[PDB]
Amino acid sequence: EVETFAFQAEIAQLMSLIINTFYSNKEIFLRELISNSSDALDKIRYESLTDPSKLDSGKELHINLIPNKQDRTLTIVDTGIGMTKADLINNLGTIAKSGTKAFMEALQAGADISMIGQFGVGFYSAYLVAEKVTVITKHNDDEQYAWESSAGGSFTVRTDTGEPMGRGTKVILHLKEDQTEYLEERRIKEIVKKHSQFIGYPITLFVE
Ligand SMILES: CCCCn1c(Cc2ccc3c(c2)OCO3)nc2c(N)nc(F)nc21
C-alpha cells in the first residue's frame, strides 16, 4: 500500500522554480547529490566510532554512479546512514523550510541556482534533469522505503519489497528526454572531475 503526501507549500514552490527557470548550468545537480552522499557517509562513519555494531549492515563506505540508457536512469548509490520514514514524511520538510526561504530570498539580489547547496536544499536540483526521482533508502533502526516524486506538489512513500540494500540511499534520476547526456561516461567523468574531485570516499562510475 502506497501513501500520498503533499509537500509543504514552500517546497512545492522551490520545485516549481527549479523546473521553470531558464538556466543552462544543469550539470551541478550531480555534485549536490554526491555532496549529500558525502555528508551521509561521514555520519555513519562518526556514529560508528562509539558503537561498532552500526556497520553490521555493511562496512564499505563508497558512492557508485550507475547509468542505464535502456532505463533512462542515473543512479547515485551510497552506503551512508540512510533515511527513516520520519525523515521522508516529516523531518526533511521541516529542515528544508528555512533553506527555501533563504534561497528564494537570495535569488532576487541576483544569486543563482548553482548556489542552492549553500542553503541545505540541493537535493531538489535533481529536478533540473529528472522528470521523476525515486529514492530507495534503508537506515538501521528501520525498514527500507521507496519515496518517489514527479513534483506536482505530492510525493509517495511505500515500503520497498525490492533488492534489500543493507544500509544507504539510492537516488534514481529518471531523466528528462533531452537530459540524456547525463548517461554518457565521458559526461559523468568531466562533471565529477570538475565539481566533485575531492570527495573523501571512493566514487565508482559504472559503465554500460
Ligand atoms: C537534508 C539532508 C539529509 C537528507 N539526505 C539527502 C537530501 C534529501 C533531501 C530531501 C529528500 C531526499 C534527500 O529524498 C527525499 O527527499 N540525501 C541523503 C542521503 N544520500 N543519505 C542520508 F542518510 N540522508 C540524505
From Swiss-Prot:
Name the residues that bind ATP: 36, 78, 97, 123
Q: Where is the signal peptide?
A: none
List every stretch annotated Interaction with NR3C1.
Answer: 1-208
PTM details?
A: ISGylated. S-nitrosylated; negatively regulates the ATPase activity and the activation of eNOS by HSP90AA1.
Q: Which residues carry this modification: N6-acetyllysine?
A: 43, 69
GO CC annotations, alphabetized = apical plasma membrane; axonal growth cone; basolateral plasma membrane; brush border membrane; cell surface; cytoplasm; cytosol; dendritic growth cone
What is an example of a GO molecular function annotated in this UniProt entry? scaffold protein binding
Effect ascribed to mutating residue 82 to D: Abolishes ATPase activity
Could you say what the effect of mutating residue 32 to A is?
A: Strong ATP-binding. Strong interaction with HSF1, HIF1A, ERBB2, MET, KEAP1 and RHOBTB2. No effect on interaction with TSC1
**Which chain regions cross the lipid bilayer?**
none
Q: Where in the cell is it found?
A: Nucleus; Cytoplasm; Melanosome; Cell membrane
Name any Gene Ontology BP term: positive regulation of protein import into nucleus
Please classify the protein's predominant subcellular localization into one broad category: nucleus
Family stated for the protein in its record = Belongs to the heat shock protein 90 family.
The free-text domain remark for this protein reads: The TPR repeat-binding motif mediates interaction with TPR repeat-containing proteins like the co-chaperone STUB1.
Subunit structure of this chain's protein:
Homodimer. Identified in NR3C1/GCR steroid receptor-chaperone complexes formed at least by NR3C1, HSP90AA1 and a variety of proteins containing TPR repeats such as FKBP4, FKBP5, PPID, PPP5C or STIP1. Forms a complex containing HSP90AA1, TSC1 and TSC2; TSC1 is required to recruit TCS2 to the complex. The closed form interacts (via the middle domain and TPR repeat-binding motif) with co-chaperone TSC1 (via C-terminus). Interacts with TOM34. Interacts with TERT; the interaction, together with PTGES3, is required for correct assembly and stabilization of the TERT holoenzyme complex.
Function, as annotated, reads: Molecular chaperone that promotes the maturation, structural maintenance and proper regulation of specific target proteins involved for instance in cell cycle control and signal transduction. Undergoes a functional cycle that is linked to its ATPase activity which is essential for its chaperone activity. This cycle probably induces conformational changes in the client proteins, thereby causing their activation. Interacts dynamically with various co-chaperones that modulate its substrate recognition, ATPase cycle and chaperone function. (Microbial infection) Seems to interfere with N.meningitidis NadA-mediated invasion of human cells. Decreasing HSP90 levels increases adhesion and entry of E.coli expressing NadA into human Chang cells; increasing its levels leads to decreased adhesion and invasion.
Question: How is this protein named in the record?
Answer: Heat shock protein HSP 90-alpha
The organism named in the record is: Homo sapiens
The gene it comes from is: HSP90AA1
Report the portion of the entire protein shown: 16 to 223 of 732
